[PDB]
PDB file of C-alpha atoms and ligand atoms in Angstrom:
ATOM      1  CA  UNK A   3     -16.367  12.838  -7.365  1.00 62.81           C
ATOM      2  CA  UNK A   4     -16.008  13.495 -11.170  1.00 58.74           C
ATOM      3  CA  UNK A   5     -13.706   9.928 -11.256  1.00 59.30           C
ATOM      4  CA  UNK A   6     -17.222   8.347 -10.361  1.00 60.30           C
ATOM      5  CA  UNK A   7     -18.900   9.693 -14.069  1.00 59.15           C
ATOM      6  CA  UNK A   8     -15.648   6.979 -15.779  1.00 57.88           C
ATOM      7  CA  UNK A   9     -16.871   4.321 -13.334  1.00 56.09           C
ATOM      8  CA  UNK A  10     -20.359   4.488 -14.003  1.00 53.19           C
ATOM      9  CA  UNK A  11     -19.888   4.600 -17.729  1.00 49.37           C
ATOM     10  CA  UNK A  12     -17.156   2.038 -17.706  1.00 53.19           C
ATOM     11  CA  UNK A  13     -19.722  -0.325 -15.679  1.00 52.72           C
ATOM     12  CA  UNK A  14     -22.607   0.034 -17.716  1.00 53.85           C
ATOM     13  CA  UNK A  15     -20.860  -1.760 -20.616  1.00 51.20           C
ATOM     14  CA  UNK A  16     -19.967  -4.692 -18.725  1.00 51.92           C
ATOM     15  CA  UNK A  17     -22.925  -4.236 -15.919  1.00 49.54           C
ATOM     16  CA  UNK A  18     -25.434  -5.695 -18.869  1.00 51.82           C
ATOM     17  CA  UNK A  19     -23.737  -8.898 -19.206  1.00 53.15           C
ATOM     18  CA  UNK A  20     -22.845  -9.459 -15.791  1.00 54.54           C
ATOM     19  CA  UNK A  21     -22.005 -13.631 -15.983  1.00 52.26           C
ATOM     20  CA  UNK A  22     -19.991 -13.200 -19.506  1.00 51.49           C
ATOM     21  CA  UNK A  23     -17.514 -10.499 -17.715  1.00 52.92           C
ATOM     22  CA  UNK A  24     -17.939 -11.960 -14.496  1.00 53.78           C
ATOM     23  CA  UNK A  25     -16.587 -15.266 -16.367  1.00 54.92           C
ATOM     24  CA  UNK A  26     -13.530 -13.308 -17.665  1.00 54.60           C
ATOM     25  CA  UNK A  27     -12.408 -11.957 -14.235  1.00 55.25           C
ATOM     26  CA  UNK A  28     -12.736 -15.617 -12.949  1.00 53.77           C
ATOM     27  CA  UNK A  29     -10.461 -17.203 -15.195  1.00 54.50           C
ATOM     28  CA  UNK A  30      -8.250 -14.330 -15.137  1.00 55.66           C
ATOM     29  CA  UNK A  31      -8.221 -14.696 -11.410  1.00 56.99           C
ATOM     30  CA  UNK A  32      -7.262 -18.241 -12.156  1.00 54.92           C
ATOM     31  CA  UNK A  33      -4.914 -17.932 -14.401  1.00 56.08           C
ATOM     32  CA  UNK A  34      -2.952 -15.840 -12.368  1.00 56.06           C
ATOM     33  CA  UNK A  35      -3.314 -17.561  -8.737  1.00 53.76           C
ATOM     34  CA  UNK A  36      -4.118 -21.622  -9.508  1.00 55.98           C
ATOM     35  CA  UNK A  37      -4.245 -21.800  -5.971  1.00 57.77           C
ATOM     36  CA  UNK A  38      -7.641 -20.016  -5.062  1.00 56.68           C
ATOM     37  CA  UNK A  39      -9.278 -22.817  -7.018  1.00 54.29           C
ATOM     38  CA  UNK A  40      -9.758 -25.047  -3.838  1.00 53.63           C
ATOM     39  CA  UNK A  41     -11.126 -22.459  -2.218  1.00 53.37           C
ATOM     40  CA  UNK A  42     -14.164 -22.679  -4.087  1.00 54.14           C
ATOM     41  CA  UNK A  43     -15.896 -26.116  -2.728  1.00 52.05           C
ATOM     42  CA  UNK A  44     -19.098 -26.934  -3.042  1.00 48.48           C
ATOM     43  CA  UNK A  45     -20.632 -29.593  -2.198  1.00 47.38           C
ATOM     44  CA  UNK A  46     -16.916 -30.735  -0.484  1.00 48.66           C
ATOM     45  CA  UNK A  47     -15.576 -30.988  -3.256  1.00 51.21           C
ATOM     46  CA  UNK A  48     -12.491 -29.040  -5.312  1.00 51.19           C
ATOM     47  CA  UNK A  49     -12.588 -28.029  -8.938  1.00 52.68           C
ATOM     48  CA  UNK A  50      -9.649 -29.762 -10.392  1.00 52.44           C
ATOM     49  CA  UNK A  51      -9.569 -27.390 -13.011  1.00 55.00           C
ATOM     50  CA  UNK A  52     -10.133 -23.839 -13.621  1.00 53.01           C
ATOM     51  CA  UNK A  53     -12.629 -24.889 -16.732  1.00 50.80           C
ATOM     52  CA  UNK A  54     -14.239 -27.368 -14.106  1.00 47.28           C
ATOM     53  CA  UNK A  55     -15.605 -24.211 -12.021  1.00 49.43           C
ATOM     54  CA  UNK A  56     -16.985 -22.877 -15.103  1.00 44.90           C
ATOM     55  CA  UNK A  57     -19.686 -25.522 -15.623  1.00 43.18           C
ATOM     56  CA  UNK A  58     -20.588 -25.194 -11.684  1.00 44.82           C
ATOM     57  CA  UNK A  59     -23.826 -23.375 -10.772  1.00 44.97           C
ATOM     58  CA  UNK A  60     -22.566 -22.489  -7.408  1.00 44.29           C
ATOM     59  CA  UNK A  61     -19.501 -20.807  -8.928  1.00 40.77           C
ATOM     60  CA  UNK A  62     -21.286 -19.260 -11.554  1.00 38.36           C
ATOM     61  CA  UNK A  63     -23.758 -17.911  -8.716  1.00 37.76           C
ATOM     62  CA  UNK A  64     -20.581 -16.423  -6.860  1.00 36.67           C
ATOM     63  CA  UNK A  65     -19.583 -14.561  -9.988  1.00 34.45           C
ATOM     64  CA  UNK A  66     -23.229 -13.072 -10.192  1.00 34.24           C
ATOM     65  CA  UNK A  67     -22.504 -12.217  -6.381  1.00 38.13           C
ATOM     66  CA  UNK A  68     -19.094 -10.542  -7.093  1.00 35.44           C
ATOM     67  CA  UNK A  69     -20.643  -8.772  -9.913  1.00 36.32           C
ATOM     68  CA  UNK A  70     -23.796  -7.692  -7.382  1.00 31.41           C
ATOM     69  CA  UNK A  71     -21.205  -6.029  -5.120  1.00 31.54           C
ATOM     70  CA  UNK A  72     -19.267  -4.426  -7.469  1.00 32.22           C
ATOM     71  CA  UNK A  73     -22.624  -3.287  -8.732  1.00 28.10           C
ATOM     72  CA  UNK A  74     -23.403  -1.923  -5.517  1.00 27.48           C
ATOM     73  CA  UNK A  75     -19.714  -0.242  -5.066  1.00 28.58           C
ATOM     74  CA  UNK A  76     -20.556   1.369  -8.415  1.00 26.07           C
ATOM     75  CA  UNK A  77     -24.053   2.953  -7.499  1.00 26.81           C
ATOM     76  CA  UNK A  78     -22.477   4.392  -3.647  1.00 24.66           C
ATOM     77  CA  UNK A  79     -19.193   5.370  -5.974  1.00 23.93           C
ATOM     78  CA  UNK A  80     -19.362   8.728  -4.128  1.00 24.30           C
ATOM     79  CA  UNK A  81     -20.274   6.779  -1.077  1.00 24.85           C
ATOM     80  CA  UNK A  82     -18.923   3.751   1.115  1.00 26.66           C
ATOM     81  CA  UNK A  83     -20.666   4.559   4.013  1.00 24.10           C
ATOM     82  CA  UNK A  84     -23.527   3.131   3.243  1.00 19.01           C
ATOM     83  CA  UNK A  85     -21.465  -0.147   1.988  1.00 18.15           C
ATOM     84  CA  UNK A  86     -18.343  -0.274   4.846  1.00 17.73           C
ATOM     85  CA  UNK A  87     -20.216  -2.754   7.211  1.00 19.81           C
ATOM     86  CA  UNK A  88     -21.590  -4.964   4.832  1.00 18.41           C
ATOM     87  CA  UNK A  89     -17.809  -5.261   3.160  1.00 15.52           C
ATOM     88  CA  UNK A  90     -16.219  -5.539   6.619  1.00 15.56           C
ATOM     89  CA  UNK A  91     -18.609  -8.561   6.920  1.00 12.29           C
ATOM     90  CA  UNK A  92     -17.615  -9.373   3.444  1.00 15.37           C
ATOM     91  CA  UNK A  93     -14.062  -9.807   4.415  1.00 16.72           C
ATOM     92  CA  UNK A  94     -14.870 -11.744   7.637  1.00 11.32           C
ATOM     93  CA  UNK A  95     -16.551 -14.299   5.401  1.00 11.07           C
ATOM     94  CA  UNK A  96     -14.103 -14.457   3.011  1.00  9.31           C
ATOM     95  CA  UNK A  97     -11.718 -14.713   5.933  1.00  8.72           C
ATOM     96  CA  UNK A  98     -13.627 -17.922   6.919  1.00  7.89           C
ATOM     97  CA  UNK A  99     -13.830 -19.607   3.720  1.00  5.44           C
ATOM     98  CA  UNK A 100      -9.604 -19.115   3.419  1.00  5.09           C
ATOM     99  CA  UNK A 101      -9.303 -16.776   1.469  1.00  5.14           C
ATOM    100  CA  UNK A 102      -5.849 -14.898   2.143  1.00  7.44           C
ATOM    101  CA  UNK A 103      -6.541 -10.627   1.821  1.00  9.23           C
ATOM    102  CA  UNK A 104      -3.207 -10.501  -0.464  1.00 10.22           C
ATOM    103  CA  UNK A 105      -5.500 -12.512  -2.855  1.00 10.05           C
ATOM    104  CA  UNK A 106      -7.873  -9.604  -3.196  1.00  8.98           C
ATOM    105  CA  UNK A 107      -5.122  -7.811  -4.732  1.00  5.89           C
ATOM    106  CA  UNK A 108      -4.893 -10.672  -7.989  1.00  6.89           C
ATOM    107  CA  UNK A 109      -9.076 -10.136  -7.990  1.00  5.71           C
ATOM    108  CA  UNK A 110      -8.121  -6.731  -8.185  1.00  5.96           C
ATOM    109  CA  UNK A 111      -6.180  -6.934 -10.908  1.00  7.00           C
ATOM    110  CA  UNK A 112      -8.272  -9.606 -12.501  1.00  8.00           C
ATOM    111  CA  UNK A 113     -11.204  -6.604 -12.485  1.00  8.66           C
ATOM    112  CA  UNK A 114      -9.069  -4.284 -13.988  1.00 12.10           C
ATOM    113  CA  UNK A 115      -8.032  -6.618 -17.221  1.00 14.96           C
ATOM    114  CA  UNK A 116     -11.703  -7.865 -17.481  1.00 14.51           C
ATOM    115  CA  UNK A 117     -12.506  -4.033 -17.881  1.00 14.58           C
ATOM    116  CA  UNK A 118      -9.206  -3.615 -19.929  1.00 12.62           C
ATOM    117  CA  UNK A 119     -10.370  -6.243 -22.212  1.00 12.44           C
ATOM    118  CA  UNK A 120     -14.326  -4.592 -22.185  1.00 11.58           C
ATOM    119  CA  UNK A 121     -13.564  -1.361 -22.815  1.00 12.10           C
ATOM    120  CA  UNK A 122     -10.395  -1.578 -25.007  1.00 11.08           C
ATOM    121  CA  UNK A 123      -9.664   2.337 -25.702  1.00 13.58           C
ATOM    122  CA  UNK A 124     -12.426   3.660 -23.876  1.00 11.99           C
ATOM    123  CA  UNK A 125     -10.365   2.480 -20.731  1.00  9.62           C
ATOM    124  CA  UNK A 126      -8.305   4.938 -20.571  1.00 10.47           C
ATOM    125  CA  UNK A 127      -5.412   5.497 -18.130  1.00 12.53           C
ATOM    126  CA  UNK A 128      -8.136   7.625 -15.850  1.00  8.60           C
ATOM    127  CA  UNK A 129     -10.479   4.898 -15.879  1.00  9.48           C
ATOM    128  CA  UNK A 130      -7.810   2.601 -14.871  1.00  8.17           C
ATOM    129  CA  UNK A 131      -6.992   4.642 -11.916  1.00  7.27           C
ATOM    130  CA  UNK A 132     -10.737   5.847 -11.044  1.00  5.51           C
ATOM    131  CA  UNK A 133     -11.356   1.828 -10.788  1.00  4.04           C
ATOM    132  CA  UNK A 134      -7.754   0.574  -9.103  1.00  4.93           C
ATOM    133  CA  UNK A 135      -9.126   3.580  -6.058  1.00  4.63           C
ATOM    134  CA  UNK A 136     -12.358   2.221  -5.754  1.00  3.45           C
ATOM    135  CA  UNK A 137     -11.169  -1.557  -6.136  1.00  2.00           C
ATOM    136  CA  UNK A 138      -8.860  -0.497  -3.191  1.00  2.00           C
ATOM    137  CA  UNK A 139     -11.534   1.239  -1.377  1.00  2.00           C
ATOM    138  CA  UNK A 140     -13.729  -1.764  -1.337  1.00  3.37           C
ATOM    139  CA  UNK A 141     -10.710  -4.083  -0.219  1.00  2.00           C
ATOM    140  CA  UNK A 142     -10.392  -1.375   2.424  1.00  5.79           C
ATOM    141  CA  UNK A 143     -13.563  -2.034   3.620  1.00  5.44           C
ATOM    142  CA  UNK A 144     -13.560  -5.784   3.189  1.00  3.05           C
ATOM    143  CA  UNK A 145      -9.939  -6.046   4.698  1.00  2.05           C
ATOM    144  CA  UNK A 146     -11.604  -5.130   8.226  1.00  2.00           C
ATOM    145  CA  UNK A 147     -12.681  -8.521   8.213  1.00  2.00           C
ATOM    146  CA  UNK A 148      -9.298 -10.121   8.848  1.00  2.00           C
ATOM    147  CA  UNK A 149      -9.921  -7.904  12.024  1.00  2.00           C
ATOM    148  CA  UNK A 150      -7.040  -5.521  11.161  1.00  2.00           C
TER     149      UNK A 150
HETATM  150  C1  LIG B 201     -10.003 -14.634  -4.157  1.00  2.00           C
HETATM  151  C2  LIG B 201     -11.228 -14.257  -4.462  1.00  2.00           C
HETATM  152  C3  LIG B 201     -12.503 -14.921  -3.877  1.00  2.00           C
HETATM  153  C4  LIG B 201     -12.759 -16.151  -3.494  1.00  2.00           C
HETATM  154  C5  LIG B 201     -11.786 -17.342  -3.398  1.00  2.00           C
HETATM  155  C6  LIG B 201     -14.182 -16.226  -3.077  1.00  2.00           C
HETATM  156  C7  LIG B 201     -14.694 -17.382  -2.572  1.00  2.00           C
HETATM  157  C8  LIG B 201     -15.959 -17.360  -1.984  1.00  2.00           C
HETATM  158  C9  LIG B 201     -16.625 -18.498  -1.420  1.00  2.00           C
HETATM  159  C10 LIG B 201     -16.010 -19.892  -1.386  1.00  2.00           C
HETATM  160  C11 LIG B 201     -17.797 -18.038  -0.929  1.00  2.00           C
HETATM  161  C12 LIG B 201     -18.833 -18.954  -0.227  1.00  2.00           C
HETATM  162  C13 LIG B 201     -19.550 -19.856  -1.241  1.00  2.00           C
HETATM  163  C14 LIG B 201     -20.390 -19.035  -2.176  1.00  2.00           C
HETATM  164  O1  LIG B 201     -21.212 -18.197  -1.668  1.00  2.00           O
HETATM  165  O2  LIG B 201     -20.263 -19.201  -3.383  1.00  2.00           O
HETATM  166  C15 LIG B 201     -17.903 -16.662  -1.213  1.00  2.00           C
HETATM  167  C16 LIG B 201     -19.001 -15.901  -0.899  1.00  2.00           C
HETATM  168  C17 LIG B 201     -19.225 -14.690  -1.468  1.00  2.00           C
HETATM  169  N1  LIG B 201     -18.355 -13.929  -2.209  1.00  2.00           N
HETATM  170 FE1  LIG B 201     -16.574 -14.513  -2.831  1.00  2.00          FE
HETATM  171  N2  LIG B 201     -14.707 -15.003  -3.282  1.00  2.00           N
HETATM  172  C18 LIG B 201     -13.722 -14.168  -3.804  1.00  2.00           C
HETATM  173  C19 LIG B 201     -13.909 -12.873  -4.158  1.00  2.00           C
HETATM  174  C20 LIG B 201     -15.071 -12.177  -4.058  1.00  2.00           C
HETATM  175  C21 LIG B 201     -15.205 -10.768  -4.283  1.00  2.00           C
HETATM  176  C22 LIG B 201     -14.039  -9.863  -4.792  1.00  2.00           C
HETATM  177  C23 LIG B 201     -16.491 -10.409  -4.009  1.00  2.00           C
HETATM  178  C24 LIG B 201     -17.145  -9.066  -4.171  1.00  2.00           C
HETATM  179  C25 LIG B 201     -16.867  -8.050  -5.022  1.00  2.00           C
HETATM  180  C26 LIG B 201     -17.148 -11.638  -3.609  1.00  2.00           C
HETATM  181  C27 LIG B 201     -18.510 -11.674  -3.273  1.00  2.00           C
HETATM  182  C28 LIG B 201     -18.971 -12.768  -2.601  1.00  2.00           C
HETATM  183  C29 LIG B 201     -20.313 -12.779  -2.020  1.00  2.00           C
HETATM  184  C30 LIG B 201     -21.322 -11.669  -2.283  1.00  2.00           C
HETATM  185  C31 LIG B 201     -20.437 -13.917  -1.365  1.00  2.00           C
HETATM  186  C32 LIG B 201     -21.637 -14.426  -0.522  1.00  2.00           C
HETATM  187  C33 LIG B 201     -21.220 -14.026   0.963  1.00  2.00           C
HETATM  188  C34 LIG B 201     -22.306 -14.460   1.939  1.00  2.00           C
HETATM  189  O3  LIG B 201     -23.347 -13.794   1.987  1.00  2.00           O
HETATM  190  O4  LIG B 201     -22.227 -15.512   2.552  1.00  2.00           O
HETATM  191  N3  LIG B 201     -16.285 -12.683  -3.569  1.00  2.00           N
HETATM  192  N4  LIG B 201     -16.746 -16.232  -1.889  1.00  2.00           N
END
């Protein structure tokens, strides 16, 4: 795919700093769904606020996760094959810890403004759609997970 060339150039930019955009799709995420905050408990307990998760290491470590397995979408762009069990089992841990797979939509669109904000003009309505089809291809994957 010739799509792949805008995702691996829009990455790099934000691939670099991984935690400081990682940070930006968080609260985004946040922002726009309050109510995955509790799903994020470490240690038993619940962030009261989205701030709060910001000074946890555990969170911060999930955003450098996230970021690892968009990094790894990025680099199979042309594939998923080599990625669709390890996002099925994704999904089935996600599943576990709550999380709903109509939430993966808001982190979907919480990736697509922290690239927004990263690449101001130089994301470009075909960058936009080049990363909403891969976003959905890894929810595709993931989604088996929720065994459906
Ligand atoms: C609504 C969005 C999400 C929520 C609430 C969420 C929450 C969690 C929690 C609570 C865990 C277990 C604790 C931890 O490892 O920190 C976890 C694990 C993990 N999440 Fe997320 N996550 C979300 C989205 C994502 C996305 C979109 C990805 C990938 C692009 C991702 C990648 C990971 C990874 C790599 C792990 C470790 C899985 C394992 O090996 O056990 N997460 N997530």
């Amino acid at each position: 795919r010739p799509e792949s060339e805008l995702i691996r150039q829009s990455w790099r930019v934000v691939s670099r700093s991984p935690l400081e955009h990682g940070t930006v799709l968080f609260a985004r995420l946040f922002a726009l769904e309050p109510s995955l905050l509790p799903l994020f408990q470490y240690n038993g307990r619940q962030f009261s606020s989205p701030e709060d998760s910001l000074s946890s290491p555990e969170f911060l470590d999930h955003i450098r996760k996230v970021m690892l397995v968009i990094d790894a979408a990025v680099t199979n762009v042309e594939d998923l094959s080599s990625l669709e069990e390890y996002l099925t089992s994704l999904g089935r841990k996600h599943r576990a810890v709550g999380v709903r797979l109509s939430s993966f939509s808001t982190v979907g669109e919480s990736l697509l403004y922290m690239l927004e904000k990263s690449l101001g003009p130089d994301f470009t309505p075909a960058t936009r759609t080049a990363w909403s089809r891969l976003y959905g291809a890894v929810v595709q994957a993931m989604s088996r997970g929720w065994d459906g």
